Each structure stands twice: as structure tokens, then as C-alpha cells.
């Protein structure tokens, strides 16, 4: 929060900081992961996960965020996650011989979008759509970093990371739709 | 074509069930045919079930109302279905062609097909608008695919063309939609 104050000082808006963080996160994911630099990629993506929380600190230290800022931040989280899984997919698909893992990665790619989508769409209709994102990233990035750990790496960790997530994510989808289903007013006709 | 909705309502099928079955058939088709290189058949099937999913709305109108859950489920299903189309096409492109830029274009399409819808849903969740800039997206990629695998007289390049246009168009759409958020009433008031 002193960081947020100093970033305000220089002329950065919260929106600008989100876009730059997302741009840097995406570039990191798409530069490092396809090269097999999985640990470095993981550290950079975690960094910019954390660094993007500074948008809220900056908004608070300006007396307020905006609705657009909220929407932009969320959209950016989706873009950034898509980019994480796409970089990992590139490494996995073209530098390994684990097609089941390619499948698991694609499931993670799609479910990371859909899980968020269900929430936003549920809210757009006045229903709830949460339950079951930081921990999903924790799983896949820890798996990757350990797989490529600078010492005593455990290559299987990527696959374990991905497969767990893929299952966990699918369940989350089902869970979230259930929360939609059981929201008050969900079944009223209009 | 509301008598199909009439008859499916009679049998006891709700719009929600029809949406779930249509989406499942579309996903099975996309993930079964596209990775095999049967692009034309895959495009026909996906187009079929695109149209077949309109029957949920027909049933809702001829039922005195859809439901909120139904809307959410139908949209969620559209997202799943689009992910499946691009995932099957990607499998084909990535492992049975030698076109790395085309893989990139397909991944861009894969992600943007989600993000475009997301911007809309999230803006509405905040009381803003987030539309403008899907039917033509599928028209593009599926036409490219079907022509690429067109019976007897195929033109393979049509796939790469289809994807590359879509990828670009899709990126354009994303920024357009955010602009519509930005210009929504109340969007930039600080709170």
C-alpha cells in the first residue's frame, strides 16, 4: 500500500497498472513456458498475480474504484489465465510425449474460463454463481515449478499438477451451476 | 420452426434438457471428428447443433417464459461448445499439420471466444453493457474447416484463412466490447 501510493505518484492509474501487469504476465507466460523455463515462468506469473492486486490498493488510496475498473480487472484475469495455460500447453504439446496431458491441459484452459464465466453470468441474471482461483493457479504453477525446479526437480509434478486441477476444475463447474440452480428465483419463469 | 418446440414440449422435455443434450452432442462431435481430420463432417455437425440449440429459446417462448437458470445454462453451454470446437480443430492443427502460426491463431480464437462472452457477462453483472463487435465467428471457422475438407473439391488453405481472420476479428471485438463497457453510464464514476 505504500507501493500503491508511489505508483499513483508517478501518473499511473489503477487501470493502467492492471493492463501493464496483465501484459507482463502474458508475455512472461508465453515467453518462458514454451521455452521449458517452467520455474521462472511460474515465479513471474505468481509475481504478476500479486502485483495486479495493487490495482485495488491504488483505487482505495484514491477514494474509489470504478465499475469499469472492476470489469477490466476481471477480463484481464481471464486473459492472463488463458495465457498461462496456453504457454504450458505449447511446452506440453510440442516438447513432451504425453497426449493425455495435452488433454488435461486443454480442460484446464477451458474450465479456467468457464468457471469465471458461470459466476459473472449468474450475477448478470441476479443469481449466485460462486464456490468450489488462486488455489487453482497455486496447483498448476507449483506442479510446473517443481517439475522444472532449479535443483532436485520432480518432472511428474507438472502432470500431477495438471490432472488434479483438471478434475478439480470440472467439479467446480458442476458445483457452480448447482449454486445457480439453487439460487432464489432461479426457476421463476419470465 | 416452432412446431418442433411444440412437440418436444408435449413429450415432457424442458428447454434446459434440450440445451444439455444439444451441447453434449456438439462437444462429442467436435472432439470426435475434428481431431480425426474429418473437418467437413465436424463443421456440419457443429452447425446442426448450433441451430438445434435455438430450440431451447423456441420452447421458452412457447412456454410463457424462460428461466434465469436457463439463460445462465444456455450461455455457459455456448462457452463449453465453443471451447470444444476450437479444441478439436487445435488437435488436428497441432499434431496433424505443420503450421505453428496457425496453432497460434487457433489458440487466440480459443481464448477470445471465451473472453468476448465474458466481457459481456461481467459488464452486465456490474450493470453496464458489454456487447457489440458469435454466429459469424462460428460461420467463419466452420466454413474455413468445411471448405478445407470439402468433399471431392477441397481447398485446404480455407482453414488457415478462416482462423486468421477470426483471430484478428476476435481480438478487435474484445477491445470494442471493453470500450462499450467504458462508455456505459456509470462505468467510470469513482466509488
Residue numbers in the entry:
A (entry chain A): 17 to 148, 152 to 209
B (entry chain B): 16 to 148, 152 to 209
The paper states:
One such potential target is the mycobacterial phosphatidylinositol phosphate synthase (M. tuberculosis PgsA1). PgsA1 catalyzes the conjugation of the 1’ hydroxyl group of D-myo-inositol-3-phosphate (ino-P) with a lipid tail of an acceptor substrate, cytidine diphosphate diacylglycerol (CDP-DAG), forming phosphatidylinositol phosphate (PIP). 1 D-myo-inositol-3-phosphate+CDP-DAG→PIP+CMP 2 PIP→PI+Pi PgsA1 belongs to the class I CDP-alcohol phosphotransferases (CDP-APs), integral membrane proteins that catalyze the formation of a phosphodiester bond to merge a CDP-alcohol and a second alcohol, releasing cytidine monophosphate (CMP). The M. tuberculosis PgsA1 was identified as a promising candidate for drug development, due to its essential role in growth and proliferation of the pathogen and differences between the Eukaryotic and mycobacterial PI biosynthesis pathways.
